Symmetry: D2
Subunit: 343 residues, 4 copies
């Protein structure tokens, strides 16, 4: 077994054909453009391999055995390490000037990044919604045959978002007849808000007091909005939220009780999911900046639109920031109950 054979370098290193050269006008920098994209695609393949392995662990029930959480979090962390490298990799293509790009651009048409199957597969499998996608036209229209079918499978199969959702719905602590997290949280917040009101009311009529009253009212609205299941359902329908109400409860349970042993690695998983969303957005941003630098202000706009919350699959995990409360309002988990979160 030889290195070059093991790595199939006879394929990988014989895959570079400059269209400039095919058309009798070889342009040096075209080679960079080819290699950069091939490297992105190798890493996309690796991301898919990790992400699929993690999807399988959820879908086949292995995640139920918490022995497997370490593997889940290491692979999701690995995805974020790769994406970080992919963001840095734009630095290489920034050594190509627009003037030099302009010398081989003609030989590329009509090929486009839009035709990256793997990038679409990755978006789909994480959980980007097609209805939420900004029109440029459809996206699969640029694909046909087996590729179009792969895309459909990726759209119909359970996404990472859906699989994490189901798992969040089973989070220990949500049972009304058990720790009854939601009931206690609602009560504690109501009481806390009542207490705060009394204090502010006790102050003497002033601009300061009014400013406090106003802030209180805002905080109150936000915190209480959390317990409005109907508003959540409405916001789901508009696609401004993605997780079921019960999954949201599970996520918040993990956030508030992150230090409890059974929740430590789950918390890291939630953190990694947010990281992946952020890094995917950063990839899109750098790509936009690159298109602009090469093609000029007039694609740029469409791609700019992709840098938005509509492409953030785990927006709900980010938005749990909005519902931070004083620590002493969090329902206490005394050791008496702590046992259910021990292992």
């Amino acid at each position: 077994l030889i290195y070059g054979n093991y790595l199939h370098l006879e394929k990988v290193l014989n895959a570079q054909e400059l269209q400039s050269e095919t058309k009798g006008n070889k342009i040096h920098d075209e080679h960079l453009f080819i290699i950069t994209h091939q490297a992105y695609e190798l890493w996309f393949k690796q991301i898919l391999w990790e992400l699929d392995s993690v999807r399988e662990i959820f879908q086949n029930g292995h995640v139920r055995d918490e022995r497997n959480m370490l593997k889940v979090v290491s692979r999701m962390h690995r995805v974020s390490v790769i994406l970080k490298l992919l963001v840095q990799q734009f630095s290489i293509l920034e050594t190509m000037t627009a003037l030099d790009f302009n010398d081989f651009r003609e030989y590329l048409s009509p090929a486009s990044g839009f035709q990256s199957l793997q990038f679409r597969l990755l978006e789909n499998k994480i959980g980007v919604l097609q209805n939420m996608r900004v029109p440029y036209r459809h996206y699969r229209d640029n694909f046909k045959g087996e590729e179009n079918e792969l895309l459909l499978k990726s759209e119909q199969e359970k996404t990472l978002l859906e699989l994490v959702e189901a798992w969040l719905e089973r989070t220990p602590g949500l049972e009304p007849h058990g720790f009854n997290f939601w009931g206690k949280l609602e009560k504690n917040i109501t009481r806390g808000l009542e207490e705060e009101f009394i204090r502010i009311q006790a102050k003497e009529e002033s601009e300061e007091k009014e400013e406090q009253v106003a802030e209180f009212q805002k905080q109150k609205e936000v915190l209480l909005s959390l317990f409005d299941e109907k508003r959540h359902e409405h916001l789901l329908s508009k696609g401004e939220r993605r997780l079921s109400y019960r999954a949201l409860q599970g996520a918040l349970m993990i956030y508030f009780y992150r230090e409890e042993p059974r929740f430590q690695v789950p918390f890291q998983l939630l953190t990694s999911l947010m990281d992946i969303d952020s890094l995917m957005t950063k990839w899109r941003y750098n790509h936009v900046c690159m298109v602009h630098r090469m093609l000029g202000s007039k694609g740029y706009h469409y791609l700019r639109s992709t840098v938005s919350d509509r492409y953030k699959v785990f927006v709900d995990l980010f938005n749990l920031s909005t519902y931070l409360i004083p620590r002493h309002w969090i329902p206490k988990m005394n050791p008496t109950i702590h046992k259910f979160l021990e292992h």
Copy 2:
């Protein structure tokens, strides 16, 4: 023309075969091991493409036309930007534990990075000398190769290296002509005079240990600075491989260093900077590779051979680094007032 066809993804993305899986025992992390190496090899190919284009520019004489220096420096800078990414890319393989690596390591034998053709081509073309390579198991590096591959390696050894091509170019650096600006002659005179002046200053100081120490430092510095004008010492150091550039090339490099702000030398100075950067980044690649071997295989050995590679013996442009040793006060540098500052304008 479609993306996947343009990039030949039918080759690139059908090149991943896990030996663990071929032998009926698929190990998840083997996939990462394969892709990481394939990405390194794509970027090695790109480095070779840039490096070869720059070698050609020197070898065919195009570098004589100073209009081409921008392209030369952009491409060498590009090589350093890629290498920096290659150093960062070790962070990905650090997400594989040694325990997990141990589950598929058996299926890899006897394949090894030693068999990376492109890595050897890159070392050769930059200018790593065969006689200066550390032997592994008392064997030649090329003995691991055969056929066309062995022949490519020979070509890479026999064709002009970047070191040789830069050498020739440095030897023609304007300002070295005895009949012209006569840089070396003036430099020797100014340093001798400067050393004399410095001796007088120190000797004028009140007898004190500080003075005694300054005396000691002076004596050291004098020996170093004067050693620069000893062409025989240089030849000796060449023979030992502690230097690599010809004496005259060294003069050219120093000319560029001291007169870097003169228009004609601004981009040449950046070139010299980039060559040092490439050497530093190559060394950092080797270091990170060694640390990786250790974390996976443990101490003992390839480890020790690889550690030997992390050294000045593998730094082709070591001479460019070592010109630091011969820094002098700015006022000792032979003056180039516009009267004589004419040949360094574009």
Copy 3:
């Protein structure tokens, strides 16, 4: 002379006071928050030092001596290397969770990064125009400052900016003289001819959608390319602040772009490249800052900050937009030996 004295560590390392601790409730992560900002401010000071040194070189006329270009480009490159580190430095503050930030946030009011003097000085000295700044809370940014600081900010607005100093230098670019190489005249003629040639080949093309689309492209390209020679449109766009450089400076920049390989233009081209880099890296800093505000405070300051991530804050947008006016290499007026040696 001792290290700690040379670096005044008696000041630097006695500058960390946790407000949480001052108020009897020390929160561990507040220390990180303090150090991170102090490090940003050290580097802002270094950027100001480089940028001011470069402004002086322009303003006092030293830049006229082309021997000084290496130092100019090294210092601007150094600014970009620092900013790159400042972008990466967000990774440290991402190790603080929103939950932990929430434990000391109250002790910070009413301090804000908005009040960073140095950040404002930096924006001003590069050339962010006050009338182009997005209002915060329906008010001017400088209202957040008082006394000496307010006065420093005004000086920074009234003194010559990097943009203005580069502009004046670009206006003197060799090659623009009608009586000499006559770059603009020749460029207009060559583009007219090239466009005519394209039309002829297009008109000769077989009636087809391929032709129809080539027609559409041609029309668009023609409009863009000819718009370049419309000085009145430029003046209009200047007035709206959608461009920043004088028409003549734009000509100089384009001269440098097209003849970058000519010896006298090699390092000037690197300077233009670096100025774009600084704008891009400033934008990346703002983007990462926004993403971090969102992660900690949730979903406004957020919306104001998002507004800052835009072309209004790109001082050298005109250097980016010269991509838009890329022409085939053969259209570029020839610089043969006869009229070569001047560069």
Copy 4:
């Protein structure tokens, strides 16, 4: 409360005095040299703050409550993220040429990085042994210090190091009890059996047999407590034999819930050692670029001598087939 006051910018941003300027010959790049070092020192202070908080969690017994492992690992991870930035930060000083450095180098003498108190504090608190430190020109490291600073350094030498605190914790790792899961006993047995099995196979070529012999020596050496004690005395190992057993327990059973975050902790300790070494390497490379020849002294610092958690790295050496690992079945799975 105003930003500049909250951050004490009246101190931080009035701490830049160029000696070149003090001596009537201002050199532009000296400013970069000062700021770079000040930034390093701010971050060293932050690393000390994290590291001390973690040492305290061990020393006050809070680590015993496994609820605190997330905080321990987050802060150690934070240390690694800072060190990574500190490695990248050399890129800034690489924008200073040696020629430009040479214009102000004279005004610096005799100041040196050797006099960085915080760097020494950091080395000490992690667990770099003084007896293992390479001497520079036959001089003690503390010789460069005096007064309260010298006293801080002594405290940092005499107080419990991160290494010692982790050691004690590793010694209490569940599973080592002979009367319980009896990890060590079972591991020794399984390895012996496996080696015997391998013998038989090869007997059933000799080139490979040679390697088998080597593996046996390595694997069996693990169970030689006396060799370990000897190597401890020479400072080629640092952890007690029992701590080593705990670490190996965590390595082999990393997926067991109670060991998942502990495994991450061990990983991060190795990361900190690696990153510290990388910092030293980049610093060496920098000295060489500017002075061109303590280049060789600094090179000596880039060694296993300065790797506090070398034992954690070396557990790679003792990897065995998965099926030799004593099984953690329901019988014992409970713990």
